[PDB]
Amino acid sequence: ANKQQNFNTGIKDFDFWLSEVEALLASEDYGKDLASVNNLLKKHQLLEADISAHEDRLKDLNSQADSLMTSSAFDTSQVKDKRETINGRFQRIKSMAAARRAKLNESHRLHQFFRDMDDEESWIKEKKLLVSSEDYGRDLTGVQNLRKKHKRLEAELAAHEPAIQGVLDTGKKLSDDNTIGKEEIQQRLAQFVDHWKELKQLAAARGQRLEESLEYQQFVANVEEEEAWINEKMTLVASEDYGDTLAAIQGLLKKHEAFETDFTVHKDRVNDVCANGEDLIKKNNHHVENITAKMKGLKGKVSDLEKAAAQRKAKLDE
């Protein structure tokens, strides 16, 4: 119930706690997300406290050692290395605890960082969803509204570009600070970049496919404009009735010489409309299909008018 027995009893108890703490510090788990990391840190704070509280016992055990080396009644050499072992071992758990606390804080910034990368990955995904629209509008006004909307989306992205780079810059910085999971951040940054590049590729294609619709709708609009005029003329021309007096003849014939002139101007605007169309075909337009058809129709109606305008004259130039 005194020193000799005491020191040795104390040393065996401390030895027991040491191996146990060492076993715990054998951990290689550092978290997989914020949830666990937090749990690991809370758990590691308890252990650190336990080791800190063990310093009194360590001070005491060394005191006992000191006073035992002051007696020749036995051979001190025994307590000597015992004192030197626990002090060594203690020092090592301190060091390891420190090492574990470091990798855990590292891990915490890592998963926190992925938290952020995630926020922007979902933002990109949302935009990918909008830009994948295949709504190209069924008419001039419609197309313009779609373009007006697409233009503000491309602005949204341009406005957000700095946040995207931020993730990137923040990330490369962790990779340089050998954050425990270097292999993991190298794969996510790579992936994060592809998503972004995709989103921009997709917005480019969409935007250009829209200009095509705009140009096309604009072509269709012009074709119909000339056809509406042709349909009108197609009518008047269908009026044979020359009354029964010479006066009404030139009256019509005059209105026909006048029609003939208008028709020249118009069948010329038709050539431009077709030239316009041909050009769209040249620049490879989504609607090379309708352009062909719409042109074949116009020209046809031009012939038809050319057929009736002649026979009317055929009676009027009498």
Please say whether the dihedral angle defined by the alpha carbons of residues 122, 124, 125 and 127, taken in this order, is positive or negative: positive
Helix boundaries (H) for the chain:
3-24, 34-53, 55-68, 77-131, 140-176, 182-237, 246-282, 288-316
Amino acid at 275: A
In order of 134, 296, 301, the CA distances from 290 in angstroms are 18, 10, 16
Sign of CA dihedral 229, 232, 236, 238: positive
Ordered by start, the domain boundaries in the chain are 5-104, 106-212, 213-318
- Per CATH, which fold does 5-104 belong to? Methane Monooxygenase Hydroxylase; Chain G, domain 1 (1.20.58)
Residue with tokens 């069948």: 267
Nearest to 110 by CA among 175, 166, 41, 193: 175
Identical fold, 106-212 and 213-318:
yes
**Alpha carbon distance 12, 196 (integer Å):** 61
With contact defined as beta carbons under 8 Å apart, do 281 and 288 qualify? Answer: yes
SS3 168: helix
Q: Give the method used.
A: X-ray
Q: For 106-212, CATH number?
A: 1.20.58.60
Fold (CATH) for 213-318: Methane Monooxygenase Hydroxylase; Chain G, domain 1 (1.20.58)
Q: What is the resolution of this structure in A?
A: 2.5
